[model samples]
Every structure is written in C-alpha cells, then in structure tokens.
Target: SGAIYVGNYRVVNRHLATHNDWANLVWEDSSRDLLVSSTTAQGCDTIARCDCQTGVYYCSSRRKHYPVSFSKPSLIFVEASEYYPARYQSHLMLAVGHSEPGDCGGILRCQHGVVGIVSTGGNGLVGFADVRDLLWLDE
Candidate 1:
C-alpha cells in the first residue's frame, strides 16, 4: 500500500550481540522468536527500550505498551527449525540488506502456522538484474 509512503515510516529497535551489546529483553519470553520489534516511530515522547527499562517513569508505565516489538517480530521462521529445515533460500547469497549481527541465519517468527520465507536476502535480491537481461537477450 506504500502506507509507509512518507519520506520515513515506523521504526523498530534490535540489539547486536556481536558486542554482547545488550541485555536480553526478550529472554523472558518462552519463545525468543522475537529478536526485535518496536511500536513504530514517535517523536521525543517516543519510548525507546533504553528509555523504558532504565526506569523513566513515563516510558515505564505510560500505559503498558502493546506487542509491537514483541509485536511483529513475533512472526518468524527461526522458531520453526525445530520441526523443519526452514529454507527460504536464495541465489542472492543473503543480500537482503544491512541486517544486524550479520543476520544470523534468521530470527523470523510465525505461530507455527507458516509459509513463504521471503525478504531474507542471499545478497542478491536482484542479482540477476543485469545478467538475466543480457542472457535473455541472447536467447
């Protein structure tokens, strides 16, 4: 819908354990399926994880934040590996984007009701762009 149509859109926060950079906010969850998620963008009044967990009363109890961080990231593929191989593979070699922690395998979520592991880049979401064009032209 291009709903995120503005020059910017909602945002989320996650941590990189590469530096053991943060404490486990989601570690409490029975399903660590959510690597990160957030309530979307807001201004200075916005609640960041640091703003909250650090005991800034306004951020801590402003009105219990709903599952936005634990929000969308809850729908993942990583959780499924217990039952299946979870290959939403690609020829791109994982070029989905500048993922954090070097995008360790996948931290996606689904309620064990799943399909279509998309958007994970193998480094070439459109790797074939020029190659395919030339190849087909020759064909």
Candidate 2:
C-alpha cells in the first residue's frame, strides 16, 4: 500500500508484479556505506549515513534514527535515472518487525544529498518503486 507523490502526480497503483522484491541486495561493510548531505527547509545542509548490515539498517538523518532490531532492510540498485545512474542510487526498503496488519514499513530513497521516505502500509508483501524517476545522489 505504498503511494508515491512526485510534484503533483500521486501514483497510487504501481505495477510491482514483475519487479524485484528486494532480491538484488549487495551487503557491504558499514564503513563503506555512503554518506549523503541534504538541504532542508531550514536551509542548512544535513548530513546522514546509510548503513546496512546483515539485513538490518539504521540510516541517520537530521531528524531522527530508528532501531533496526526487527526490521528486514535491503539495499537495491535502481538502474535508470541519470541521478541514480544504475548502481549509484541504492534504495533502502524495509519491513518493520512482523509486518502484520498494523505494522509500519515502507521505502527509503537517499540520493543527490536528500533522503525521502515512502510509508507503504502493512497490507501485503508489496512495495512502490520506479527506477527511472527515483531521486538519488551520486555514488
């Protein structure tokens, strides 16, 4: 139940039928993780770290950082947009804990100095993604 809103286009139903369901994950050392900086509405550049290890994650941002204890975190490469450029943009999607009826989870995109989060509801094993237009930073 992930709804994506870019500009004014609210893409509610994304065809993820043939999409890779977090199958292309490349786990690397936390030290090698990418550190991105984004400018918020406050006008100050906020630096964050994308760290994933053993199917768990804890990405930092200017606002907050959450626990990765029972989350299924996966990093996938979106191969399209010039911004992401294939392996550059690593989209982080996760399923919080059991992902039961009321569990909260969604997709996390960090690229081009910004971090975006899309809260895909806990309905089923579904997600929202568009490699071509996904925003990301240079790797």
Candidate 3:
C-alpha cells in the first residue's frame, strides 16, 4: 500500500473511496529491462541516466554500457523543501512504479553510455507531454 505524508497533513482514511488499485504491467523486452541506479538511497532521479546524490550517471548504450529496457517502470519523489505541494494527482493515478517522498531527482537510468530518465504518460506510454507545476517527468 502507498501513503502520502505532506508535512503534518497526511490524507489517510479521509477518502477511502478515492484510492486506486495497483496497475498491471508487461515486459515486452524481458531480456533488457530498465531501472534506476541501485547505488542511490531509494534508487531514482529526474533523469534517465543513473546518478548518485554526490555523483553523476554516465549514459552509454554500448554493449559494455548499462542496459535500457522499455519493460521497467518510472519512479518519483518530492523535493527537499520544508513545505510540500498542495495538490497531488498522479496523472493516470496508477502506474508501474513511483518515486516515494523524500527521493531527490526522482528517477534515472543508464544505458549505451547514455544516461536518461524514464518515460511517463497514460499507462507507461512515452509521448510528448506538456505537464507543468507537477512533477517534471521524462523530457
């Protein structure tokens, strides 16, 4: 189960009817799956290339480079501001993965010498997006 803690205001049990269930996902390229840099504390950033809070993620799609797969999911987290945002509506509300609160940068991946961020949209569909004010997804 997922929970959102906005400072001292946690919207728990206020609206049970608004909660959504888990989403089903499939790995088209099970051989090459994508993921955030496991070296991270929670493993995620706002970019595709894997990076550490004290370091960086080097992207490389070469054979010796990291792997990039479309089967994996996206992750997100909140910034390190003393005050949090007011509204939190996860676009589709259900996805393959999520970046938990307190995670910096949110999500990242490295492959073929090119590090990049995961894509997000309606149900893991990567496309052109114009979302603003909320979390800045893959660009």
The candidate scoring highest on TM-score is 2
Which stretches of model 2 miss by more than 4 angstroms?
A: 1-41, 53-66, 69-90, 97-116, 123-139
Candidate achieving the largest lDDT: 2
| TM agreement with the true structure for every prediction | 0.18, 0.24, 0.18
Q: Ranking by lDDT, best first?
A: 2, 3, 1
Model 3: ten consecutive residues of lowest lDDT? 21-30
Per-residue accuracy of model 1 over 60-138 as CA lDDT, tens digit each: 2122211111111222333133323553222111112233222332322123211111222233221100011111111
Pitting candidate 1 against candidate 3, the one with the higher lDDT is: 3
lDDT of 3 by residue, 43-117 (tens): 122322332111121122211222223322223332233333423223111123322222211222333211322
Off by over 4 Å in 3: 1-95, 117-139
Error of 2 at 69 (Å): 4.2
- Give per-residue lDDT, candidate 1, residue 49: 18
